């Protein structure tokens, strides 16, 4: 309820529903159209990509993600979980899941080293950059559940 | 020469980088395969058996002492996990700036399953933003996503 | 849902994982040592590969505090399988407590099939500046058995 | 139920059954073999070696040992009880019982003096050492029911 | 705890362990050998054959069978459930499961029509006969969880 | 005192006693049948002695209503011992219920060591003018096994 | 474990099962009626097959007492799948209560894709010798829609 | 099972044990004193052996609080037997209470067969700073009898 894994799952559910409504034909008129997503996960397929580094924390994050999906009406049969050695290769694995036509949304979970950098970090900047570019190119929601130690 | 061989190289960044490449290569080979029947949550993870896989390594020549221990660390990781020394292609480049372009050429071959990039970076004795280091990370990340083939990052700071 | 909660955990670093790797490395090392020698002309180096195909293993685990011990055993099995081993070639033996580990391990090590043994357990107290008799005997027994039978035995206990 | 004599008896029963199963031929295959011992004492012969020193406590320990064996289906006819002056000579007496072909397990019961030693005790270290070596050499379970005052 | 499905599962577990011990080599001697099976299901594979006729009752019976196996240390992953139209064809389906080398025991569950027969019933007599003959020929335990309405 | 109360009872007539004698007689009878023939010149008569020295037996007993079954088993053991048998040469197998007797008996009868098998158990109800399926199958199974393996099997069940 | 407890149940006889079969039969019957006629020379008989391959279905279900309704819906889906249908060709619509079934069903029946509609729900009370207005309207609405659009609509409600 | 529970106890230190040893030592001491003297030339030392073969003993025990007294008597018998005595040569006398011990002991000590007497009993109260008349008389009586008859009498009472 209070971990970033829970929050990341909710965002994925809402975005998946929102996309489903947008492709529908527009209304007749006579008012301002408003589009929004509901929080029911029934009938949706999800994928999760998680890193093993600093495993003490991620298991709690992956825990929340699976719990949230089921609690909101999702069927545990529809979750695909992929594990990778470190955070450097989350984007490449996420891309393989996102290209499957049977996946509606993807959730990325990981942990990054301390953020007391002098000015910049060269590994953290690539994970966020890659996921963002991937979402726009494939036109499919990808959620960022990464946290900083 | 025997003094050089006696040193241990388990655990250096060459070792970890190669180990990640082996896992990712097996993981992708599983994903492309047929999906499971169902009836449960379906988990994927890469095995650590390296037999039958082809690897490529790109290493710079700057600081010839540090690099060699890293390259030898990568090779022994592949061999000790079942790989054959006949299935490794090694490419050497003048400096860290031209690692991405060489890594691109290797990655486009159909006979390569993963690529490992090794090098060292010069650390100025005051913390400014390095315009060379950022370009290596940016270039390697783009290549992997575009070519859909895992590339591992094995550089260190002096 | 609890089945996925427990199955979603990872077991990559616990002492069961490292104990398994040492057994894999030592088992392969012995095959090379008692094989044919080298051609000479240079210093000869021996080291064990991490390929676990065709090797037979045995695991002895105590039952005290089974919540933690169960996770160590799962870690050991995962290490063997992920390195190419077959779950068909693992024998598991459970014993009441730590005092019984050396005698059970002695039975398994005398079989011709097995190539290495892994001992897993949790010791009592331990965090006191005093000599503990149960802890000393278990360490002594495993060490003596390995030297007598000339077969590697790995020591994967912890304190709590 | 709560004394070390009760616990020592249970361990002896379980180890005796476990050894009986191990000597059996291995299975066909197709799964991971798992070996364990059951808690039925029927048809098993036991021996007990107890010391007389500080007799106020040991009688309760020997009490538990005999009670546990009978409660779990053991026949009182199959218990052999041997008494010795002190703890120093438990190992030598235990060795004589363990070499009999009609004994399946041996239980050793005794009490040791206060454990507030400076660094080491020279009598306690020999009882545990001797019993452990004896078990491995003879390949027969020997249980340690000794306690510290 | 009180339904025939629960009882049938326990019998299958005990018989599977008993067979495992018998194939082991005999003891040295010096006493009467006694063989028995323990009630731990860990590492055992089971198969269940159930009929659909009068489904109101069998679901409770199949319920007990699966519950008993799990409660006694069995892994739900190792249960194979097969459903058949009626009781007449339980034996033929049970035979297909029993011939698999990955199955340790088979449980048959079904319901038979009222037992106020004049002298004999021609369908009930064949189910019991077939299962009994099948067990002896294949040398594998098959349990009878059938009940009479 | 209860140990002597139970030990002071006698077990000379219960169905366990007669079942054991039949096994002893049949086991000795078969040795003579498949031995050398007689000299002829007169009608040849075969009959089994009641000496139980050097014979191996196996007993299969169900666990339902163990109060009565335990006394039948003790009767069978007493008969063998009192006729010269050794308790070392008896194998005892326990099964959950009556339905499992024939399959267990089949396992024991296939061993080369054993010379006869004794089946003991208590059936359910029985005192009704109706055909019982469990009772019929147990009788059928034991009869078929004996004829197939050519080894005597004795039938010592009762009704209650 | 509850997932297998619910998954181990069977759904072969509930009203959802029969409602699905009627839709399958009627949908196939209409294809033959509006096809080419027979050769004559004998009485012509029309009847619908039970092959559900290539047919599109729609299901409207109320939400009152979802414990029972959920089981009726699962029964309907099982019937279609077990007769050769594809779960890809099923549309499911949920409505707050029984009063809203006819209007929702009207929307689905006007699509050119669908071949039959199945209505599922649970009515209130019902077990009283009185005329109920909600029950009468729901039955009336479905009957009128079927005749107007010339498309079969099946009626799978129950009382409780 | 209670027979082994009581039989498994030990009786090595209770006052019955020490009382028996004193009687054994004194009985042997008297035989040496009234025997032939030494050769002189050095200081002569007399002391009694602990060999109890060929000696006859008598035991007088009160019946109050028989739970404790019974254990003291068993301790005395064990001491005599374990030092080489025969249970055939022990006479046991039971009396109602402590007041009757001296008179009964006087009867046994006058027999020519017996060599020493052991008195066992439990006194009442005792844990009060007051002079008790029963306690004083019992001690006085035993002391006087020993000096008059010149035969050792041991005093093995306790307070509770």
CA H137 – CA H140 distance, rounded (Å): 5
Q: Does B157 touch chain A (CB under 8 A)?
A: no
d(CA A78, CA G92): 19
Instruction: Report d(CA D66, CA D68) in Å as an integer.
Output: 6
Q: Are C4 and B41 a contacting pair at CB < 8 A?
A: yes
Shortest Cα distance, chain D CAs vs residue H14, angstroms: 11
CB burial string A106-118: b at 16+ within 10 A, e below: bbbbbbbeeeeee
Chain D residues lying within 8 Å of H4, measured CB to CB: 66, 76
Task: State the Cα–Cα distance between residues D68 and D64, nearest whole angstrom.
Answer: 6
Task: Inspect the structure and tell me whether chains A and C have 3 or more CB pairs less than 8 Å apart.
Answer: yes
**What is the resolution of the experimental data for this entry, in Å?**
2.4
**A69 touches A10 (CB < 8 A):** no
Nearest 5°: CA angle at G71, between G70 and G74?
90
Give the other-Cβ count within 10 Å of D113's Cβ. Answer: 14
Q: How far apart are CA C8 and CA A134, in angstroms?
A: 26
Sheet holding D142-144, edge to edge: D79-84, D46-51, D105-109, D142-144
Query: Which residue matches tokens 């034909």?
Result: A25
Instruction: Answer whether D26 touches E (CB < 8 Å).
Output: no
Chains touching D, CB cut-off 8 Å, 3+ pairs? C, E, H
E73-91: b (≥16 Cβ within 10 Å) or e: ebeeebbebebbeebeebb
Inter-axis angle of helices C66-82 and C15-33, to 10 degrees? 40
CA pair distance H113, D96, nearest whole angstrom: 43
The per-residue DSSP string of C104-148 comes to: HHHHHHTSSS--EEEEEEEES---SSS--HHHHHHHHHHHHHHHH
Question: What's the start-to-end Cα distance of chain A, in Å?
Answer: 20
Q: Can you tell me whether residue F5 is helix, strand or coil? A: helix
Contact state of E101 with D28 under an 8 Å Cβ cutoff:
yes
Contacts of D144 in chain C (CB under 8 A): 99, 134
Check CB contact under 8 Å for E52 and G12.
yes
Q: What DSSP character marks residue E26?
A: P
H helix or E strand, kind and range, residue A102: none
Out of B20, B145, B148, the one facing A85 most closely (by C-beta) is: B20
Q: What's the CA gap between E7 and D143, in Å, rounded? A: 37
* Residue E86 · residue E52 · CB < 8 Å: yes
Chain E nearest C-alpha distance from F59 (Å): 10
Q: Do A63 and C10 touch (CB under 8 A)?
A: no
Catalytic residue IDs of G: 130
If 0-12 CB within 10 Å is exposed, 13-18 middle and 19+ buried, where does residue D68 land?
Answer: buried
> What is the maximum span of chain F, computed from C-alpha positions, in angstroms?
63
Q: Measured on CA atoms in the order D3, D6, D12, D13, is the torsion positive or negative?
A: negative
- Closest residue to E136, CB basis, from F95, F133, F141: F141
Q: How many CA atoms lie within 13 A of A36 on its CB side?
A: 3
Q: What's the sign of the alpha-carbon dihedral F64, F67, F69, F74?
A: positive
Query: Min CA distance, E63 vs chain G (Å)?
Result: 6
Beta carbons of B82 and C51 less than 8 Å apart? yes
Check if C144 contacts D (Cβ < 8 Å).
yes
- In this complex, is the C-beta atom of D92 within 8 Å of any C-beta atom belonging to chain H? no
Q: Is A78 on the interface with C (CB under 8 A)?
A: no
Residue reference for tokens 């159930």: E50
> Which of F106, F133, F134 lies nearest to residue E136, judging by beta carbons?
F106
Does B24 touch chain A if contact means CB atoms closer than 8 Å?
A: yes
Q: Tokens in use for H145?
A: 């009898």
**Is the Cβ of B3 closer than 8 Å to some Cβ of chain C?**
no
Alpha helices in E23-138 (DSSP H): 55-71, 90-98, 124-138
Contacts of E59 in chain G (CB under 8 A): 8-10
F130 given a catalytic annotation: yes
In angstroms, the CA H57 to CA H79 distance is 12
- Interface D-H, measured as beta-carbon pairs within 8 A, has a size of 22
Helices and strands, counts by H and E, chain B = 5, 5
B52: contact with C, CB 8 A cutoff: no
> With contact defined as beta carbons under 8 Å apart, do C99 and C137 qualify?
yes
Q: How were these coordinates obtained?
A: cryo-EM
Beta carbons of B49 and B79 less than 8 angstroms apart: no
In chain B, which residue's Cα lies nearest the Cα of C29?
Answer: B80
Judge: C8–A52 Cβ closer than 8 Å, yes or no. Answer: no
Q: What angle do CA A120, A122, A123 make, to 5 degrees?
A: 125
Distance CA C82, CA C110 (A): 27
E33 vs F90: CB contact, 8 Å cut-off? yes
C83 vs B: CB within 8 A: yes
What value, to the nearest 5°, has the Cα angle with vertex D97 and ends D67 and D88?
A: 90
With CA atoms as reference, the chain A residue closest to C9 would be A59
Residue H149 CB contacts under 8 Å (≥ 6 apart), including other chains: H109, H110
Question: Which residues of chain D lie closer than 8 angstroms to C140, CB-CB?
Answer: 129, 132
- Is D25 at the interface with chain E, CB within 8 A? yes
């Amino acid at each position: 309820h209070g971990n970033k894994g829970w929050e990341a799952a909710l965002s994925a559910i809402e975005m998946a529903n929102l996309f489903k409504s947008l492709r529908g034909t527009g209304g007749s008129g006579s008012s301002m159209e408003i589009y929004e997503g509901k929080l029911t996960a029934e009938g949706l397929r999800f994928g999760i990509v998680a890193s093993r580094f600093n495993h003490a924390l991620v298991d709690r994050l992956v825990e929340g993600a699976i719990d949230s999906i089921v609690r909101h009406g999702g069927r545990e049969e529809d979750i695909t979980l992929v594990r990778v050695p470190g955070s450097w290769e989350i984007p490449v694995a996420a891309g393989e899941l996102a290209r499957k036509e049977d996946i509606d949304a993807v959730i990325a979970i990981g942990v990054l080293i301390r953020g007391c950098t002098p000015h910049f970090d060269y590994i953290a900047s690539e994970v966020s950059k890659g996921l963002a570019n991937l979402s726009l190119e494939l036109r499919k929601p990808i959620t960022f559940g990464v946290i900083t130690a």
